[PDB]
Amino acid sequence: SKPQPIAAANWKCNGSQQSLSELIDLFNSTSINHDVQCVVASTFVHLAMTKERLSHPKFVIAAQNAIAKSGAFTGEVSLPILKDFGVNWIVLGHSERRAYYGETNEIVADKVAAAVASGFMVIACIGETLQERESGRTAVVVLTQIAAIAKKLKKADWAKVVIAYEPVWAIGTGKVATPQQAQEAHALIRSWVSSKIGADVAGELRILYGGSVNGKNARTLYQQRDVNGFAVGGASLKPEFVDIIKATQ
């Protein structure tokens, strides 16, 4: 059966002190009685307050990015700084950083490896664009992305790895990905991990859906065989994130 599900809130580059404190207390108010790891990835600026306001025992705090080492990298935040700050979860390789901020497969893979080596739980993001999917390259791109990461890890490292599949191809179109399309990509990923890493690793690996999800379709997405939770974008800044948490049963 499925391993422990994860409900991750990627706030992206958003938030004010007052609005986040209120959303934080909403999360604090939620009764969560099943086994699920909830994650809040705030901006670097808001990590201190999120550490301070978020008291729900099923929640942990994550960063949205880092570089591997401290030093002369003005504007960036390193893994040791986050570790010293009590942050033990991190999102790496998000489609927005791959598109805007120069993160090639190799750059993502080296960050993921460094984060695992530093003791982090890592939500490593993969996924293909619309031009890639329409040209028949979904499997090429997605398995290239994860192999680039895998080649920098050891088998035991995967206990600290979570995969988030982003259907980047669905943005801008008039139709979100279907649950069947989501399950298709998740099943492809898990099949690859079983074959190249190990069936034991594949059975314990969490593969999170990273497309648009709301309280109405989250339950159906989680009902899919190879879906272990969500890495949520805009809905994670809203009260309906609670309904997404509840959709992980």
Among 2, 147, 220, 234, binds Na ion (CB under 5 A): 220
Among 73, 119, 135, 195, binds a copy of itself (CB under 8 A): 73
Site string (22-51) toward a copy of itself, x via CB under 8 A: ---------------------xxxxxxx--
Q: Using CB under 8 A, which of the segments 29-37, 57-65, 137-145, 219-227 binds a copy of itself?
A: 57-65
Residue 1 CB contacts under 8 Å (≥ 6 apart), including other chains: none
Residue 59 CB contacts under 8 Å (≥ 6 apart), including other chains: 27, 38, 39, 40
Q: How many CB atoms lie within 10 A of CB 92?
A: 27
From 96, 103, 128, 166, the catalytic residue: 166
- For helices 179-196 and 138-150, the axis angle rounded to 10 degrees is 40
Question: Is 10 annotated as ligand-binding?
Answer: yes
70 binds, among Na ion, a copy of itself, none (CB under 5 to 8 A by kind): a copy of itself
Q: Using CB under 8 A, which of the segments 77-85, 179-187, 215-223, 238-246 binds a copy of itself?
A: 77-85
240 is catalytic: no
Residue 248 CB contacts under 8 Å (≥ 6 apart), including other chains: 5, 6, 7, 34, 36, 222, 229, 230
Burial 157-196 (b: 16+ CB within 10 A, else e): bbebbbbbbbbbbbeeeeebbebebbbebbebbbebbeee
Among 1, 57, 72, 175, binds a copy of itself (CB under 8 A): 72
103 is catalytic: no
**What are the C-alpha distances in Å from 98 to residues 34, 71, 75, 108, 129?**
34, 23, 18, 8, 11
Q: What is the DSSP letter of 187?
A: H
Q: What is the DSSP letter of 172?
A: T
Query: Taking CB under 8 A as the rule, does residue 214 contact a copy of itself?
Result: no
Say if CB 122 and CB 92 are below 8 A apart: yes
24 binds, among a copy of itself, Na ion, none (CB under 5 to 8 A by kind): Na ion
130-189 residues in contact with a copy of itself (CB under 8 A) are none
Query: Taking CB under 8 A as the rule, does residue 17 contact a copy of itself?
Result: yes
Query: Taking CB under 8 A as the rule, does residue 4 contact a copy of itself?
Result: no
Query: Taking CB under 8 A as the rule, does residue 107 contact a copy of itself?
Result: no
Question: Is 14 annotated as ligand-binding?
Answer: no
Q: Using CB under 5 A, which of the segments 4-12, 22-30, 95-103, 125-133 binds Na ion?
A: 22-30
**Active site residues per annotation:** 94, 166
